[PDB]
Structure formats: structure tokens, C-alpha cells
């Protein structure tokens, strides 16, 4: 009846802010979240946090929410998982929720809920920049061009895993252009230091919709990469999967998720 929940900041799905200075509490639509390093203070809000609030209410559990510091979403290195996936896999958390992408590798070792956000991989470029998309040889045969195209991703997640598995030559080229967070990637794109940023589609599309001046645009990967979704990670064989799935499927049909997309993921640019 009390669940430990791991999450990770990735705006606008999970947004972290200090407690209200005046009250010392998390006000508005925010909820208390602590750091993995530790153990109000910090407070979390956003699309995934609203999902979590509704699940807790509908299913009837209480929870302790914490932010992962041991890596990010989840990466397996030399036999060991880090990030949100590792927290669930090693049973430090009963579930993990955030912008967490379902893939085959992860699905082998944790159970996921049904997907509640559609995503995949997209490419973001400055509106001026002329490429056709991820099929462009500027991407696919990157060192065939005299001044080479500069393109990168934020490493360690499902995006990099997909590129390394399916397009190993392109992946090897991208390594020098790894970015530490989406915020720095966007900054490099705008400074011309990158020509393109390849990343999670749900996040990139949102960033395009919110770009001041609407100067950043995304191209869908088309057939280059498959579509997938965000899912809540749970212990393999978790008793929580079924009630969570039922709730999520209910939210979908009630237009509750659609409402939350409007609330959190809308922007001015189109
Ligand atoms: N949401 C993705 C982030 C990425 O593509 O790097 C993940 O769970 O790994």
C-alpha cells in the first residue's frame, strides 16, 4: 500500500523546483521529492507527476518519490544497470515513472505498464538548415562530406542504444557530438555548433513547439526508426502492473491523458 517511486527530471514530463520559500512547502500542483543521494525540500511537477498523482488516487496507494542520481533513464554497462531501470531492477524502487522509453533490452528485465505517451526518435534542426531527414546521406554517410555534418544525441539512453544497434557507422560518428542534457544540445544547435540533434521524439517535438521565435524544427525519423512509448517500469512479475494498466487505460478513455497533453505539452509553434 506504500510504494517507493523513482523518477528523473526531464521537462516537461518531470520538472523539479525548490520548495516555496515562504511556506517551505510544495505548493500548487507539485509534490515532495527527495534526491537519491539523500537518504518538501525539492518539489516535482509535470505530465508524469500528474499521472502518478492520479494513479495513487485511483488505485489507492501512498508513495515516496525520489530523483535518480545514479545515471539517468537506464543503461547497462558491463553487466550492471544504472538509472531508473536499475532502481527498479535491483528492487530499490517499486516503480519508476518519467519519460522512460520502452525498449526490448529493458523489457527483458523489468515489466512495463502499457505505454501512455507515444514516442520514438526525431531530428531537430534550425529552420534554415536543409536536410531531408534521417535518411539523408549527410547523416548516413557522415564522413563522405568535406565539412562534415555535426550531429549528436544525449548518450546512454534508448536513442543512443537504437542508433548503435541499427546504424553502427552513424553511431560511431556521433560520439564526439554527445551532449550532456537537452538544454545544452539546444544551445549548441542555436549556436551552430551542432547542425542537428537526434533525440526522443516526445521531448523534441515539445521543444520545437516551445522554441522562442519558432526557429527550431523537428523532422520525424519516418521508417529510419520505429515508434515506441513511455511506460512505467515495475519489478518483473509485479503485482502492480495490472491495476496500473487498468487505471491508465481508463485515463486514456476518459480523455484524462488527452487533457494532460493539452495542459503540459502544448506550445505556440507549429
Ligand atoms: N526517454 C529515453 C531517453 C533517450 O532516448 O536517451 C530513455 O528512456 O532512454
Short mmCIF file of C-alpha atoms and ligand atoms in Angstrom, two decimals:
data_model
loop_
_atom_site.label_atom_id
_atom_site.label_comp_id
_atom_site.label_asym_id
_atom_site.label_seq_id
_atom_site.Cartn_x
_atom_site.Cartn_y
_atom_site.Cartn_z
CA UNK A 1 0.00 0.00 0.00
CA UNK A 2 3.06 2.26 0.18
CA UNK A 3 5.24 2.40 -2.92
CA UNK A 4 8.73 3.79 -3.40
CA UNK A 5 8.83 5.57 -6.75
CA UNK A 6 11.90 6.58 -8.71
CA UNK A 7 11.85 9.46 -11.18
CA UNK A 8 14.16 11.75 -13.12
CA UNK A 9 13.95 15.36 -14.24
CA UNK A 10 13.12 15.78 -17.91
CA UNK A 11 10.96 18.77 -18.68
CA UNK A 12 8.02 18.92 -19.20
CA UNK A 13 7.41 15.31 -18.13
CA UNK A 14 9.13 15.77 -14.79
CA UNK A 15 10.08 19.25 -13.56
CA UNK A 16 11.99 19.87 -10.33
CA UNK A 17 11.81 23.11 -8.33
CA UNK A 18 12.71 24.23 -4.78
CA UNK A 19 10.02 24.33 -2.08
CA UNK A 20 8.13 27.65 -1.86
CA UNK A 21 10.48 29.93 0.11
CA UNK A 22 7.58 31.48 2.05
CA UNK A 23 5.81 28.35 3.27
CA UNK A 24 8.67 25.88 2.98
CA UNK A 25 6.22 23.51 1.32
CA UNK A 26 5.50 22.30 -2.20
CA UNK A 27 2.59 24.43 -3.31
CA UNK A 28 0.40 24.39 -6.41
CA UNK A 29 0.35 21.13 -8.33
CA UNK A 30 3.76 19.99 -7.06
CA UNK A 31 4.63 17.10 -4.80
CA UNK A 32 7.60 16.50 -2.48
CA UNK A 33 10.51 14.58 -3.95
CA UNK A 34 13.90 13.81 -2.43
CA UNK A 35 17.26 13.04 -4.03
CA UNK A 36 18.65 9.52 -4.33
CA UNK A 37 21.83 10.98 -2.82
CA UNK A 38 19.79 11.90 0.28
CA UNK A 39 18.53 9.00 2.44
CA UNK A 40 9.22 19.14 0.70
CA UNK A 41 12.80 20.48 0.14
CA UNK A 42 12.62 19.69 -3.58
CA UNK A 43 9.25 19.56 -5.36
CA UNK A 44 8.26 17.79 -8.58
CA UNK A 45 5.53 18.53 -11.12
CA UNK A 46 4.75 17.85 -14.76
CA UNK A 47 2.94 15.45 -17.08
CA UNK A 48 4.29 12.26 -15.50
CA UNK A 49 3.79 13.58 -11.98
CA UNK A 50 0.11 14.28 -12.76
CA UNK A 51 -0.16 10.69 -14.00
CA UNK A 52 1.40 9.48 -10.76
CA UNK A 53 -1.00 11.59 -8.66
CA UNK A 54 -4.00 10.09 -10.46
CA UNK A 55 -2.73 6.51 -10.15
CA UNK A 56 -2.14 6.93 -6.41
CA UNK A 57 -5.64 8.30 -6.01
CA UNK A 58 -7.41 5.81 -8.27
CA UNK A 59 -5.63 2.67 -7.07
CA UNK A 60 -5.21 3.94 -3.52
CA UNK A 61 -1.54 3.80 -2.60
CA UNK A 62 0.73 6.25 -0.84
CA UNK A 63 4.25 6.81 -2.16
CA UNK A 64 7.75 8.12 -1.53
CA UNK A 65 9.09 9.86 -4.65
CA UNK A 66 12.82 10.28 -5.30
CA UNK A 67 15.04 11.59 -8.05
CA UNK A 68 17.64 9.23 -9.51
CA UNK A 69 21.29 10.37 -9.31
CA UNK A 70 22.86 7.07 -10.34
CA UNK A 71 22.74 7.83 -14.06
CA UNK A 72 19.54 8.74 -15.90
CA UNK A 73 16.91 6.63 -17.69
CA UNK A 74 18.80 3.36 -17.80
CA UNK A 75 21.97 1.98 -19.30
CA UNK A 76 23.56 -1.44 -18.96
CA UNK A 77 27.36 -1.43 -18.71
CA UNK A 78 29.50 -4.50 -18.05
CA UNK A 79 26.52 -6.47 -16.73
CA UNK A 80 25.11 -3.76 -14.42
CA UNK A 81 22.12 -1.42 -14.87
CA UNK A 82 22.03 2.19 -13.73
CA UNK A 83 19.36 4.91 -13.85
CA UNK A 84 15.62 4.46 -13.31
CA UNK A 85 15.77 0.97 -14.81
CA UNK A 86 18.48 -0.09 -12.36
CA UNK A 87 16.46 1.24 -9.39
CA UNK A 88 13.54 -0.99 -10.36
CA UNK A 89 15.66 -3.99 -11.49
CA UNK A 90 17.63 -4.02 -8.24
CA UNK A 91 14.42 -3.55 -6.29
CA UNK A 92 15.38 -0.21 -4.76
CA UNK A 93 12.09 1.20 -6.07
CA UNK A 94 8.71 -0.45 -6.66
CA UNK A 95 8.24 1.53 -9.84
CA UNK A 96 9.83 4.21 -11.96
CA UNK A 97 7.86 6.86 -13.80
CA UNK A 98 9.01 9.62 -16.12
CA UNK A 99 9.97 9.98 -19.74
CA UNK A 100 11.08 6.34 -19.67
CA UNK A 101 11.14 4.65 -23.08
CA UNK A 102 10.08 1.03 -23.60
CA UNK A 103 12.66 -1.00 -25.47
CA UNK A 104 13.45 -4.70 -25.91
CA UNK A 105 16.55 -4.70 -23.74
CA UNK A 106 14.74 -3.10 -20.80
CA UNK A 107 11.54 -5.15 -21.29
CA UNK A 108 13.59 -8.33 -20.82
CA UNK A 109 14.43 -7.45 -17.23
CA UNK A 110 11.63 -5.21 -15.96
CA UNK A 111 7.90 -5.21 -16.59
CA UNK A 112 6.44 -2.07 -18.18
CA UNK A 113 2.93 -0.71 -17.91
CA UNK A 114 1.01 -0.20 -21.13
CA UNK A 115 2.50 2.85 -22.89
CA UNK A 116 0.84 6.17 -22.06
CA UNK A 117 2.79 8.55 -24.34
CA UNK A 118 3.75 7.81 -27.92
CA UNK A 119 7.38 8.48 -28.74
CA UNK A 120 10.31 7.38 -30.85
CA UNK A 121 13.23 9.23 -32.39
CA UNK A 122 13.19 12.52 -34.27
CA UNK A 123 15.74 15.03 -35.53
CA UNK A 124 15.78 18.70 -34.67
CA UNK A 125 17.45 21.31 -36.88
CA UNK A 126 17.44 25.08 -37.27
CA UNK A 127 14.60 26.09 -39.60
CA UNK A 128 17.13 27.26 -42.19
CA UNK A 129 19.14 24.03 -42.24
CA UNK A 130 18.37 21.91 -45.30
CA UNK A 131 18.43 18.17 -44.74
CA UNK A 132 15.71 15.73 -45.80
CA UNK A 133 15.64 13.81 -42.54
CA UNK A 134 17.48 10.84 -41.04
CA UNK A 135 17.73 9.17 -44.46
CA UNK A 136 19.95 11.99 -45.73
CA UNK A 137 23.46 10.77 -46.56
CA UNK A 138 24.72 13.79 -44.62
CA UNK A 139 23.62 11.65 -41.66
CA UNK A 140 24.10 8.12 -43.03
CA UNK A 141 27.45 8.54 -44.78
CA UNK A 142 28.67 11.31 -42.43
CA UNK A 143 32.39 11.37 -43.30
CA UNK A 144 31.68 11.42 -47.04
CA UNK A 145 31.19 15.22 -46.91
CA UNK A 146 34.04 17.77 -46.92
CA UNK A 147 32.86 19.89 -43.99
CA UNK A 148 31.06 17.07 -42.13
CA UNK A 149 27.58 17.46 -40.64
CA UNK A 150 27.71 17.93 -36.88
CA UNK A 151 25.03 15.89 -35.17
CA UNK A 152 24.66 14.32 -31.78
CA UNK A 153 22.39 12.99 -29.09
CA UNK A 154 22.35 12.81 -25.31
CA UNK A 155 24.05 9.45 -24.79
CA UNK A 156 23.22 6.47 -22.53
CA UNK A 157 19.50 6.17 -23.27
CA UNK A 158 17.16 4.41 -25.70
CA UNK A 159 18.00 6.80 -28.51
CA UNK A 160 21.73 6.07 -28.47
CA UNK A 161 21.02 2.35 -27.98
CA UNK A 162 18.79 2.28 -31.07
CA UNK A 163 21.35 4.12 -33.23
CA UNK A 164 24.23 1.92 -32.09
CA UNK A 165 22.20 -1.27 -32.78
CA UNK A 166 20.73 -0.30 -36.15
CA UNK A 167 23.19 2.24 -37.61
CA UNK A 168 26.57 1.43 -36.04
CA UNK A 169 28.57 3.51 -38.54
CA UNK A 170 26.48 6.62 -37.93
CA UNK A 171 26.66 5.96 -34.18
CA UNK A 172 30.46 5.87 -34.21
CA UNK A 173 30.47 9.25 -35.95
CA UNK A 174 28.05 10.83 -33.42
CA UNK A 175 30.08 10.00 -30.34
CA UNK A 176 32.22 13.17 -30.47
CA UNK A 177 29.00 15.22 -30.55
CA UNK A 178 27.40 13.73 -27.41
CA UNK A 179 25.57 16.36 -25.34
CA UNK A 180 25.16 16.31 -21.56
CA UNK A 181 21.50 17.44 -21.40
CA UNK A 182 18.80 18.58 -23.81
CA UNK A 183 19.29 22.17 -22.68
CA UNK A 184 22.93 22.23 -23.80
CA UNK A 185 22.09 20.42 -27.04
CA UNK A 186 19.52 23.12 -27.90
CA UNK A 187 22.08 25.82 -27.09
CA UNK A 188 24.62 24.17 -29.38
CA UNK A 189 22.04 23.83 -32.14
CA UNK A 190 21.28 27.55 -31.94
CA UNK A 191 24.97 28.48 -31.82
CA UNK A 192 25.57 26.44 -34.97
CA UNK A 193 27.89 24.14 -33.00
CA UNK A 194 25.53 21.32 -33.93
CA UNK A 195 23.64 21.14 -37.20
CA UNK A 196 21.18 18.59 -35.85
CA UNK A 197 20.10 16.96 -32.59
CA UNK A 198 18.72 13.43 -32.64
CA UNK A 199 16.64 12.51 -29.60
CA UNK A 200 13.43 11.25 -28.03
CA UNK A 201 10.52 12.37 -30.20
CA UNK A 202 8.06 13.37 -27.47
CA UNK A 203 10.63 15.67 -25.88
CA UNK A 204 11.98 17.11 -29.16
CA UNK A 205 8.55 17.81 -30.56
CA UNK A 206 7.67 19.66 -27.37
CA UNK A 207 10.88 21.70 -27.50
CA UNK A 208 10.09 22.67 -31.10
CA UNK A 209 6.60 23.77 -30.07
CA UNK A 210 8.05 25.98 -27.31
CA UNK A 211 11.07 27.45 -29.12
CA UNK A 212 11.25 31.26 -28.73
CA UNK A 213 10.96 32.66 -32.24
CA UNK A 214 10.00 29.19 -33.50
CA UNK A 215 13.44 28.81 -35.07
CA UNK A 216 13.89 25.12 -34.22
CA UNK A 217 12.00 22.42 -36.11
CA UNK A 218 11.82 18.63 -35.92
CA UNK A 219 11.71 16.04 -38.68
CA UNK A 220 10.17 12.66 -37.85
CA UNK A 221 12.52 9.73 -38.42
CA UNK A 222 9.99 8.08 -40.73
CA UNK A 223 11.00 4.48 -41.43
CA UNK A 224 14.55 5.03 -40.12
CA UNK A 225 13.41 4.31 -36.54
CA UNK A 226 10.38 2.62 -35.03
CA UNK A 227 7.74 4.17 -32.81
CA UNK A 228 7.53 3.20 -29.16
CA UNK A 229 6.14 4.72 -25.96
CA UNK A 230 6.87 5.81 -22.39
CA UNK A 231 5.92 3.15 -19.85
CA UNK A 232 6.11 2.88 -16.09
CA UNK A 233 8.79 0.38 -15.10
CA UNK A 234 7.93 -2.24 -12.48
CA UNK A 235 9.59 -5.32 -10.96
CA UNK A 236 9.44 -8.28 -13.35
CA UNK A 237 6.21 -10.05 -12.39
CA UNK A 238 5.00 -7.10 -10.32
CA UNK A 239 1.52 -7.37 -8.82
CA UNK A 240 1.21 -3.66 -9.57
CA UNK A 241 1.25 -3.97 -13.36
CA UNK A 242 -2.39 -4.97 -13.73
CA UNK A 243 -4.01 -2.26 -11.57
CA UNK A 244 -1.71 0.34 -13.09
CA UNK A 245 -2.58 -0.78 -16.65
CA UNK A 246 -6.30 -0.72 -15.92
CA UNK A 247 -6.08 2.78 -14.45
CA UNK A 248 -4.00 4.07 -17.38
CA UNK A 249 -6.38 2.54 -19.89
CA UNK A 250 -9.24 4.20 -18.01
CA UNK A 251 -7.45 7.57 -18.09
CA UNK A 252 -6.96 7.22 -21.84
CA UNK A 253 -10.66 6.54 -22.47
CA UNK A 254 -11.79 9.29 -20.11
CA UNK A 255 -9.78 11.79 -22.18
CA UNK A 256 -7.78 12.40 -18.99
CA UNK A 257 -4.46 11.77 -20.76
CA UNK A 258 -5.53 13.97 -23.67
CA UNK A 259 -6.32 16.69 -21.14
CA UNK A 260 -2.85 16.29 -19.59
CA UNK A 261 -1.19 16.55 -23.03
CA UNK A 262 -3.03 19.84 -23.57
CA UNK A 263 -2.03 21.02 -20.10
CA UNK A 264 1.66 20.14 -20.27
CA UNK A 265 2.78 19.58 -23.84
CA UNK A 266 1.17 22.36 -25.83
CA UNK A 267 3.12 25.23 -27.34
CA UNK A 268 2.86 28.18 -29.71
CA UNK A 269 4.93 26.99 -32.67
CA UNK A 270 3.52 24.80 -35.45
N1 LIG B 1 13.48 8.51 -22.90
C1 LIG B 1 14.71 7.92 -23.40
C2 LIG B 1 15.84 8.95 -23.44
C3 LIG B 1 16.81 8.72 -24.61
O1 LIG B 1 16.34 8.42 -25.72
O2 LIG B 1 18.02 8.84 -24.42
C4 LIG B 1 15.11 6.77 -22.49
O3 LIG B 1 14.29 6.28 -21.70
O4 LIG B 1 16.27 6.34 -22.53
#
